[PDB]
Amino acid sequence: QPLPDCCRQKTCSCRLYELLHGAGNHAAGILTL
Known about the structure:
Name: Orexin-A
Assembly: monomeric
Oligomer: monomer
PDB class: neuropeptide
Structural class: mainly alpha
Entry title: Solution structure of Human Orexin-A:Regulator of Appetite and Wakefulness
Keywords: turn, helix-loop-helix, neuropeptide
């Protein structure tokens, strides 16, 4: 039932935080003023 450990079984929220930090070239460029 717990299903694959998706970051503390948080529904795999890391998925969004992954593309945001890893493939977030668009987000980083904006976070750098």
